[PDB]
Amino acid sequence: GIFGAIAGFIENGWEGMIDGWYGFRHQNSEGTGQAADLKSTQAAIDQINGKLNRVIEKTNEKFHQIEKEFSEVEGRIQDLEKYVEDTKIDLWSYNAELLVALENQHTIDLTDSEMNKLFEKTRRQLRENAEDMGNGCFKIYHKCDNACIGSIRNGTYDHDVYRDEALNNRFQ
Amino acid sequence: GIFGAIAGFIENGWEGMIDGWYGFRHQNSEGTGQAADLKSTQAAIDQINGKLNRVIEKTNEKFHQIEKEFSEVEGRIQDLEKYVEDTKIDLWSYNAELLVALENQHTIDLTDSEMNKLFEKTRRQLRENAEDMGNGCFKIYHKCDNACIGSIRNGTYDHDVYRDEALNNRFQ
Amino acid sequence: GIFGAIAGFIENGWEGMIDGWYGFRHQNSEGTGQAADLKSTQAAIDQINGKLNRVIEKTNEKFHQIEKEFSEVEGRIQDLEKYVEDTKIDLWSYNAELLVALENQHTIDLTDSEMNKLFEKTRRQLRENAEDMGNGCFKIYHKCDNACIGSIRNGTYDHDVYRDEALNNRFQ
Amino acid sequence: PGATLCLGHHAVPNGTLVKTITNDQIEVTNATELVQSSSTGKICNNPHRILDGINCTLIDALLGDPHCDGFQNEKWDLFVERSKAFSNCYPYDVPDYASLRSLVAS
Amino acid sequence: CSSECITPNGSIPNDKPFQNVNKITYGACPKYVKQNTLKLATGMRNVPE
Numbered sequence: 001g002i003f004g005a006i007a008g009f010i011e012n013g014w015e016g017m018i019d020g021w022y023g024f025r026h027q028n029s030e031g032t033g034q035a036a037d038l039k040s041t042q043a044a045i046d047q048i049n050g051k052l053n054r055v056i057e058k059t060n061e062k063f064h065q066i067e068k069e070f071s072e073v074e075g076r077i078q079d080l081e082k083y084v085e086d087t088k089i090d091l092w093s094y095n096a097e098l099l100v101a102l103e104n105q106h107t108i109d110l111t112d113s114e115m116n117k118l119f120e121k122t123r124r125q126l127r128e129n130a131e132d133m134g135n136g137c138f139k140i141y142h143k144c145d146n147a148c149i150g151s152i153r154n155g156t157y158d159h160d161v162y163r164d165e166a167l168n169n170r171f172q
Numbered sequence: 173g174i175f176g177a178i179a180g181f182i183e184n185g186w187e188g189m190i191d192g193w194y195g196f197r198h199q200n201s202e203g204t205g206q207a208a209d210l211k212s213t214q215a216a217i218d219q220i221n222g223k224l225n226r227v228i229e230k231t232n233e234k235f236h237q238i239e240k241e242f243s244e245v246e247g248r249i250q251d252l253e254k255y256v257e258d259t260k261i262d263l264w265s266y267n268a269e270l271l272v273a274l275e276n277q278h279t280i281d282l283t284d285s286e287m288n289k290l291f292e293k294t295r296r297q298l299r300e301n302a303e304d305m306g307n308g309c310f311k312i313y314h315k316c317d318n319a320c321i322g323s324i325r326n327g328t329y330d331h332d333v334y335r336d337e338a339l340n341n342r343f344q
Numbered sequence: 345g346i347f348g349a350i351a352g353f354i355e356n357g358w359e360g361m362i363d364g365w366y367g368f369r370h371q372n373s374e375g376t377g378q379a380a381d382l383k384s385t386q387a388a389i390d391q392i393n394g395k396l397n398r399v400i401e402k403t404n405e406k407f408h409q410i411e412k413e414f415s416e417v418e419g420r421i422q423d424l425e426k427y428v429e430d431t432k433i434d435l436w437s438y439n440a441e442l443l444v445a446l447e448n449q450h451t452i453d454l455t456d457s458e459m460n461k462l463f464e465k466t467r468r469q470l471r472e473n474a475e476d477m478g479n480g481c482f483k484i485y486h487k488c489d490n491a492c493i494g495s496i497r498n499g500t501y502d503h504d505v506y507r508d509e510a511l512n513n514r515f516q
Numbered sequence: 517p518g519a520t521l522c523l524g525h526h527a528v529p530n531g532t533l534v535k536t537i538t539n540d541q542i543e544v545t546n547a548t549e550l551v552q553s554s555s556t557g558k559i560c561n562n563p564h565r566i567l568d569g570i571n572c573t574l575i576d577a578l579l580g581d582p583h584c585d586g587f588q589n590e591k592w593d594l595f596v597e598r599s600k601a602f603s604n605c606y607p608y609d610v611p612d613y614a615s616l617r618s619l620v621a622s
Numbered sequence: 623c624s625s626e627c628i629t630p631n632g633s634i635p636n637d638k639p640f641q642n643v644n645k646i647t648y649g650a651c652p653k654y655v656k657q658n659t660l661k662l663a664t665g666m667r668n669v670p671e
């Protein structure tokens with residue numbers, strides 16, 4: 001993907017994350033656990049639904065048209081009728097092929113984006129209290145219990161509370 | 173947007189910025205002020221104009237064609253003439269719809285990009301003298317008067333000048 | 345490009361890099377040298393080849409069709425035959441124009457991406473042992489001989505080995 | 517003493533392969549079919565008014581071939597001509613048959 | 623039964639934008655294409671261990 005997160009610096013996805021599309025796993029003094037991030041899951045899904053609504057959209061309505069099957073050889077005028085239909089089908093076939101390929105490239109890129117946005121939002125929250133370990137994981141340089149982890153996921157983690165402790169651990 | 177800046181980590185736009193598309197607002201010992209960034213404004217605009225020139229481009233010229241309105245019922249040959257025109261109009265209608273939707277997605281993404289490029293160029297300039305506060309703002313850990321702010325916007329800010337002072341403030 | 349690396353924070357390309365599309369140049373106690381990065385070169389190329397295979401793909405096969413050149417003035421039916429062909433050619437001309445323009449925009453963006461992915465993978469490897477100098481270059485704050493540089497390119501550089509030394513140099 | 521916080525995304529046991537701009541087969545978590553390829557096999561009699569021609573072509577119902585007398589004054593949204601139809605009156609031909617059948621049908 | 627789109631093979635649903643059933647149609651029908659399948663991704667890259 002164009003951001004390098006999914007199938008990039010995050011080695012692989014999590015089959016055990018069954019209640020969201022993106023999320024956090026943590027390790028701390030009390031153990032390990034997981035949680036979905038709703039707002040990024042919803043972002044990816046909303047975009048994808050936007051794209052579905054545009055495509056699953058009302059088919060045109062046509063009634064009487066030209067004929068497209070013929071029981072007798074007639075020559076010039078039937079040549080035309082066939083060429084007309086064959087030309088339309090090829091054009092529409094091309095459109096459908098291109099559409100699906102563009103959308104799919106964009107779908108894979110936008111979901112990559114969201115993963116990357118969530119990571120960056122997290123990196124920003126932690127300030128000087130953590131280092132990026134390169135695989136999508138943050139080493140956090142202070143005691144960080146389940147509530148603390150919870151505040152990181154809520155967006156109410158106050159880095160100044162932990163700053164003297166983390167800076168001390170980071171630089172020795 | 174695909175980078176997460178506009179309508180992302182920057183809460184909202186500035187109606188008061190009337191002389192550029194992107195810019196800086198600062199707070200320091202002398203007060204607060206604003207300034208447009210010309211080079212990123214010009215980047216967004218140039219791309220958008222490129223895209224306009226491609227689209228507003230010379231319409232094709234057609235002269236004598238087929239007829240498209242008919243006062244008498246005729247059957248087979250008029251069925252064909254109508255089907256031919258109806259097929260072309262639908263194809264062109266589809267093209268126009270797709271074009272506008274692709275371009276608009278790309279326009280919103282490229283302008284997002286520029287905002288994000290400007291931010292990153294700034295983060296790089298400041299080195300160890302500032303921290304990203306998460307909302308598009310840099311906390312600068314040294315006295316930074318209007319000229320100093322000016323040098324950050326000119327691209328001639330010399331971080332080594334302020335480094336001992338900032339490192340001292342950042343780590344305590 | 346949409347990431348800001350090629351023709352952005354990297355001033356220019358290297359005509360001397362003749363064995364890869366992306367790579368490293370280093371300066372250290374033993375001198376200066378260069379090396380290609382194979383895995384990012386291969387990523388860009390693979391994508392581009394994917395896109396070529398989709399396009400250079402089997403042309404459709406048509407046989408008997410309508411006529412497209414005429415030696416006598418005939419009126420209504422020849423008007424139709426010409427209008428049909430002229431309509432198809434314009435539609436295909438449009439498709440080909442759009443295709444090439446979309447692909448080219450995406451090709452320039454994906455190669456930009458790869459350059460940027462490689463940089464970020466590197467920044468992550470070095471942790472607290474280096475600072476980004478803004479022009480695509482990392483200042484490394486420890487003695488880093490040819491093997492050390494080699495380990496950075498292999499992906500087996502162990503930042504903890506150099507950490508006390510770098511932190512000491514960085515903060516003074 | 518510290519913690520580790522890991523960022524990630526889901527995967528599924530049964531991915532499906534789709535086509536992209538740069539990749540002929542790449543695996544995603546889910547996808548949806550955009551080409552209808554099956555039919556129930558029947559013509560539905562709502563919401564369009566279907567008139568089954570049974571043994572009769574439109575032209576025969578027009579002229580009033582005796583076995584087609586049941587079609588006198590009928591209306592239709594879609595007239596269905598069956599392959600088993602047959603003529604059983606005076607042997608006739610229509611110059612531009614296709615056009616007559618078209619304009620009546622329409 | 624009820625269905626907006628008719629083909630000589632029988633009626634077809636019209637929830638999808640394209641169809642491979644018959645170039646001949648009546649009503650509100652998906653557009654006819656040569657492909658028998660086109661899958662539109664509705665999730666991210668599947669990347670298992």
Ligand SMILES: *[C@@H]1O[C@H](CO)[C@@H](O[C@@H]2O[C@H](CO)[C@@H](O)[C@H](O)[C@H]2NC(C)=O)[C@H](O)[C@H]1NC(C)=O
Nearest residue numbers: 048049052056528545546547548549663664665
């Ligand atoms: C595969 O993708 C589709 C489209 O996003 C999903 O189908 C939808 O699921 C919702 C919620 O359960 C339904 O209410 C909709 O009616 C479905 N939409 C369509 C287009 O059918 C589905 O979630 C995915 N399939 C699996 C197994 O996850």
Ligand SMILES: *[C@@H]1O[C@H](CO)[C@@H](O[C@@H]2O[C@H](CO)[C@@H](O)[C@H](O)[C@H]2NC(C)=O)[C@H](O)[C@H]1NC(C)=O
Nearest residue numbers: 069553554555557629630631632642643644645
């Ligand atoms: C709908 O009807 C058409 C025509 O009756 C079917 O197309 C035929 O497909 C078979 C087998 O693939 C070919 O041997 C015939 O030559 C085709 N006939 C024509 C005129 O194209 C088609 O299979 C039917 N569609 C479905 C899905 O039932």
Ligand SMILES: *[C@@H]1O[C@H](CO)[C@@H](O)[C@H](O)[C@H]1NC(C)=O
Nearest residue numbers: 146147148149150151154156
């Ligand atoms: C989430 O935020 C709420 C509201 O501020 C707070 O009460 C709670 O402690 C946070 N969650 C956790 C698990 O700490």
Ligand SMILES: *[C@@H]1O[C@H](CO)[C@@H](O)[C@H](O)[C@H]1NC(C)=O
Nearest residue numbers: 318319320321322323326328
């Ligand atoms: C901008 O750069 C110029 C030229 O180097 C310099 O004279 C000036 O001090 C800078 N601007 C401000 C407001 O400091």
Ligand SMILES: *[C@@H]1O[C@H](CO)[C@@H](O)[C@H](O)[C@H]1NC(C)=O
Nearest residue numbers: 490491492493494495498500
């Ligand atoms: C590259 O990695 C290999 C295998 O671990 C190692 O032997 C070598 O030292 C590294 N390359 C250089 C130039 O140091």
Ligand SMILES: *[C@@H]1O[C@H](CO)[C@@H](O)[C@H](O)[C@H]1NC(C)=O
Nearest residue numbers: 569570571572583600601602
């Ligand atoms: C149609 O034709 C066949 C042969 O005449 C006959 O047996 C059948 O009854 C006819 N069908 C109807 C419904 O009139």
